[PDB]
Amino acid sequence: QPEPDMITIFIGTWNMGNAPPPKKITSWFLSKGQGKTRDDSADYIPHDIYVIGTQEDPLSEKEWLEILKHSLQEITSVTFKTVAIHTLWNIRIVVLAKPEHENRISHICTDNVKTGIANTLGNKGAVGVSFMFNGTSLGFVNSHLTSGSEKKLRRNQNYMNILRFLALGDKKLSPFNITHRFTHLFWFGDLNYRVDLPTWEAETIIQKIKQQQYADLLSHDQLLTERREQKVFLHFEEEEITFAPTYRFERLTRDKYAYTKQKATGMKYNLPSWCDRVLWKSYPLVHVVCQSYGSTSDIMTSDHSPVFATFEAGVTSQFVSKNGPGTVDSQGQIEFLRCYATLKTKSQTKFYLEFHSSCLESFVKSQEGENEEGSEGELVVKFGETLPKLKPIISDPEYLLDQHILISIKSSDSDESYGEGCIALRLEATETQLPIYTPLTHHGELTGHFQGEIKLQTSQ
Numbered sequence: 002q003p004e005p006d007m008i009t010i011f012i013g014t015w016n017m018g019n020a021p022p023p024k025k026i027t028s029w030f031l032s033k034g035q036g037k038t039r040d041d042s043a044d045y046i047p048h049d050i051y052v053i054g055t056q057e058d059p060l061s062e063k064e065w066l067e068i069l070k071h072s073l074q075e076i077t078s079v080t081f082k083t084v085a086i087h088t089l090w091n092i093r094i095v096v097l098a099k100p101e102h103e104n105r106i107s108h109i110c111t112d113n114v115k116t117g118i119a120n121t122l123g124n125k126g127a128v129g130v131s132f133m134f135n136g137t138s139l140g141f142v143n144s145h146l147t148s149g150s151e152k153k154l155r156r157n158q159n160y161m162n163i164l165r166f167l168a169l170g171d172k173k174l175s176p177f178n179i180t181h182r183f184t185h186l187f188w189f190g191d192l193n194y195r196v197d198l199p200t201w202e203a204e205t206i207i208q209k210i211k212q213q214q215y216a217d218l219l220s221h222d223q224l225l226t227e228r229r230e231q232k233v234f235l236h237f238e239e240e241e242i243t244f245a246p247t248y249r250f251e252r253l254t255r256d257k258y259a260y261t262k263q264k265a266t267g268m269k270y271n272l273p274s275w276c277d278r279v280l281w282k283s284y285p286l287v288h289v290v291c292q293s294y295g296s297t298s299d300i301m302t303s304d305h306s307p308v309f310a311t312f313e314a315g316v317t318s319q320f321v322s323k324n325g326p327g328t329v330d331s332q333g334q335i336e337f338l339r340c341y342a343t344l345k346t347k348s349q350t351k352f353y354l355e356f357h358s359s360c361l362e363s364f365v366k367s368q369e370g371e372n373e374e375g376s377e378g379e380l381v382v383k384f385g386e387t388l389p390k391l392k393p394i395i396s397d398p399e400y401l402l403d404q405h406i407l408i409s410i411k412s413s414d415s416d417e418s419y420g421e422g423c424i425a426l427r428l429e430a431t432e433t434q435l436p437i438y439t440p441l442t443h444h445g446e447l448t449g450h451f452q453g454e455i456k457l458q459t460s461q
């Protein structure tokens with residue numbers, strides 16, 4: 002029975018509005034409704050992994066697991082195994098996998114982050130799950146961010162707190178936050194970003210939605226504009242939106258958007274918005290393709306509609322050779338040549354690098370670099386040909402060309418990371434000096450760049 006090199010992953014996000022679901026929710030898991038939908042000829046083909054994020058979920062874990070599992074069994078005639086379930090308040094994540102995957106899945110982690118302070122602490126935040134699927138690390142985050150059209154900057158702050166403080170994946174990757182710990186990271190939820198148009202335009206917006214004319218609405222979507230200005234979700238992807246706004250509906254129909262201010266809304270308007278979103282970030286040159294992104298039309302218990310997204314994702318096998326794991330393979334080496342970091346910092350500490358990768362027995366610390374001043378005010382840290390030669394555990398190019406090197410640049414004075422990035426070993430050539438590049442971030446914001454050349458020796 003061969004190991005897969007690609008799996009499909011279902012991501013769902015649904016703010017249930019504190020109401021029990023209707024008796025049939027299969028359209029969600031089939032990616033049917035509006036937007037980029039799944040072909041009918043695939044309806045009986047199970048996804049490998051289903052990740053369900055809810056917000057304002059009124060059900061017990063047991064109640065929701067029975068609904069989810071019975072839904073999937075009806076669609077696929079497969080009884081899924083529960084990988085993980087984690088709930089913070091009314092925010093929940095469930096991961097289900099085909100039974101054949103049970104022994105491929107290990108290192109299962111869960112965590113949550115509560116956002117805000119005092120007044121603003123007690124219902125918003127995120128839950129997440131991570132695990133290994135054979136040689137591939139997968140992370141999933143369901144967040145319920147701050148509500149309200151005038152609170153986009155709080156949502157952005159909620160995002161940074163979640164990526165800083167959510168503790169998932171390999172704890173040995175100490176300089177790295179969740180935006181660098183996984184081959185594939187999916188971040189979804191009720192992100193609560195709104196269409197920023199004047200209140201007076203509510204009926205105009207409704208008109209546009211009825212005509213399926215979303216362009217002048219998407220151009221005011223706060224998540225798209227904040228991303229374009231690099232204020233949030235830096236280096237994440239989102240599929241183009243081709244479905245109607247998923248909030249705020251009158252319950253029990255989808256014919257009406259309920260936008261006007263009421264005591265129940267704190268006297269706030271809720272113009273039609275794409276609150277409910279799925280984004281992802283995968284390591285460079287790893288296969289990931291969105292094959293659906295849309296909303297259901299027939300699940301109407303909540304003031305939100307469910308949102309689905311599905312993905313092809315590249316995965317790798319748990320590689321064994323006669324040498325590694327348990328030793329190095331001296332037919333392999335990674336040389337970083339003529340490298341330099343460009344940093345936005347004003348500090349004048351010396352810096353060193355750490356190289357982290359599951360192709361190494363343990364992380365590798367460099368010598369300190371040589372600081373120079375850039376012509377436009379920047380710090381340039383030069384490493385020369387001084388960098389340690391990295392000794393991978395396995396030299397076979399079928400393994401090594403699929404790996405990645407995480408890089409942290411750290412202050413000698415504080416040992417704190419000033420920037421994190423990732424280099425793919427999926428090179429055009431071996432035994433050849435080739436350019437490499439990564440942006441560097443810290444707490445998910447841009448702090449600099451790392452560039453230079455690499456020379457990769459494999460056993461071929």
Ligand SMILES: Fc1ccc(CNC[C@H]2CCCO2)cc1
Pocket residue numbers: 082083084085097098102103104105106107
């Ligand atoms: F749904 C799931 C999926 C995975 C698991 C954990 N399986 C661990 C692997 C390694 C050791 C033997 O199986 C439980 C439930």
